[PDB]
Structures are given as C-alpha cells and as structure tokens.
Design an enzyme around this catalytic site. Sequence first.
Site, PDB file in Angstrom:
ATOM      1  N   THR A  29      -8.593   6.146  -5.887  1.00  0.00           N
ATOM      2  CA  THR A  29      -8.889   7.580  -5.840  1.00  0.00           C
ATOM      3  C   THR A  29      -8.077   8.421  -6.820  1.00  0.00           C
ATOM      4  OG1 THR A  29      -7.426   7.544  -3.952  1.00  0.00           O
ATOM      5  CG2 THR A  29      -9.779   7.748  -3.527  1.00  0.00           C
ATOM      6  N   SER A  30      -8.626   9.567  -7.217  1.00  0.00           N
ATOM      7  CA  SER A  30      -7.938  10.469  -8.135  1.00  0.00           C
ATOM      8  C   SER A  30      -6.641  10.992  -7.529  1.00  0.00           C
ATOM      9  CB  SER A  30      -8.837  11.638  -8.523  1.00  0.00           C
ATOM     10  OG  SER A  30      -9.779  11.236  -9.497  1.00  0.00           O
ATOM     11  N   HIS A  88      -0.761   5.208  -9.321  1.00  0.00           N
ATOM     12  CA  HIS A  88      -0.869   4.421  -8.093  1.00  0.00           C
ATOM     13  C   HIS A  88      -0.072   3.156  -8.372  1.00  0.00           C
ATOM     14  CE1 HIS A  88      -3.899   6.199  -5.434  1.00  0.00           C
ATOM     15  NE2 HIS A  88      -4.584   6.550  -6.507  1.00  0.00           N
ATOM     16  N   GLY A  89       0.210   2.378  -7.337  1.00  0.00           N
ATOM     17  CA  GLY A  89       0.946   1.155  -7.563  1.00  0.00           C
ATOM     18  C   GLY A  89       1.354   0.432  -6.310  1.00  0.00           C
ATOM     19  N   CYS A 130       3.271   4.285  -5.236  1.00  0.00           N
ATOM     20  CA  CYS A 130       3.532   3.596  -3.973  1.00  0.00           C
ATOM     21  C   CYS A 130       4.141   2.248  -4.278  1.00  0.00           C
ATOM     22  CB  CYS A 130       2.253   3.391  -3.175  1.00  0.00           C
ATOM     23  SG  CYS A 130       1.570   4.924  -2.618  1.00  0.00           S
TER      24      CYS A 130
END
EC number: 3.4.22.56
Lengths: 140, 91, 4
Positions: A29-30, A88-89, A130
């Site tokens: 997601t954005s 993200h991650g 994350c």
Amino acid sequence: DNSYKMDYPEMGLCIIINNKNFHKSTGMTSRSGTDVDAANLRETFRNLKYEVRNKNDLTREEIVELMRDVSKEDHSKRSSFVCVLLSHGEEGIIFGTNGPVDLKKITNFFRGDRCRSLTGKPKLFIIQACRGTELDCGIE
Amino acid sequence: KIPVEADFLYAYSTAPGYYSWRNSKDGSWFIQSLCAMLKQYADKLEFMHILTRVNRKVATEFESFSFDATFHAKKQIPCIVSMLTKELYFY
Amino acid sequence: DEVX
C-alpha cells in the site's frame, strides 16, 4: 581527540530515499504522509549544511544503482554521510517500488575497502520502515 | 587498521521485529520526532544524546488509534545501533 | 495511523 573531525570543507551528503507509491503487483500500500517526512528531513539536514538529494519512488535496482554511484564519488572534502530510507520493509530488508533490497547489500557499498574516502568518517543510516509484525501493547 | 563495520550508525524507527508507525497527515512518529530534536539540540548535544531524546519522545508522546482493536493503542520505541568510534557533534 |  575523541570526537569526529567535522571541520572538513562540507558537512557531507544526505541521500533521502522516499518511497510512497509501489507497484500493484507487489501488493504494498501507498505510504501516506511520507512526503511530510521527506520535506521535514530536507529542511533539517539543509540547515545542517549537508548536500541533500531527494530521490522518490525508486525500484530495487535504482536503489542499488544510486548507492553504488554515491560510493564511487570522492568524499575526501566531506565530513560525513547520511542516508535516510523511508519505505516499507522487514528485518534486514527495505522495499524498492518493485521488490525488497537487503540493507546489508547497500550498506556494504560504504564499508571501509569499498569507500575509502569515507574511512574514519561517520556513515549514518536513518531508517523509517517496519522491521517485522509485532505490536507493542505498552504498560503503565 | 580498523574494522570495516566501524563508524556505522543505524537509527531505526522501531525495535527489532516490530511494526513502525506512520501518520497519514503528520508523517512518521520517528521522523517528526527526529527533526524536532535535531533543530533544538543539534548545536548543544552530542548525537547519541539527541537520539536518546527521540527515544523518549516517540515512546512517551505517541500512541496509535484505529477502529481495529488489534492495532489500537500500541506504542513504539526506536532503536539505536552504533558502531561509531567517536562522539558526533554538528558544529 | 498506518504501519510500515
């Protein structure tokens, strides 16, 4: 002497990789609000005399590519290196727009033998992503 | 001769294995706290002390809100990993 | 609030 020599001609580089929009195929997601972070950071590090460079929505390849090119530059007149990654991650991994890049990989481009111009200089990596899926329920 | 991993500092937004919080309009808890502290102390404190301030700010002033009970009222504590050999000041 |  017990502190890093910050008197070099310029404070150093500051690469900020801001990833907001990901490919549909990834199912990521954005990242709404990340622009505020990219904007805020740009100002702060600007006021610290760093040469800020904003890179938005980069693919895993473009990330490595950028880090490879930044390491091959001459940093002899620079005091430090700051790298910010907004994306993200998971543990040891940050997402490019099309796939994951393991931190270790892009970090290696700057370790001693790879980037001699930054040897003995602080290489700072600030990471907003994350690192897993646990939730901290707090106390008191 | 020094170690190749020396002089590295990784300032993570959250603890190992945890989610990291971001706000749709305000930005991420970590970054907004980071910049705040830098502005105020970059010319008074050593980097490690600044990051410690951020830890307190994020850990104290922030808590999540969601309609999903599972993700509601959660906290976050940043994580500093330093392999720096000396102190760092921005002046 | 959203996660990363």
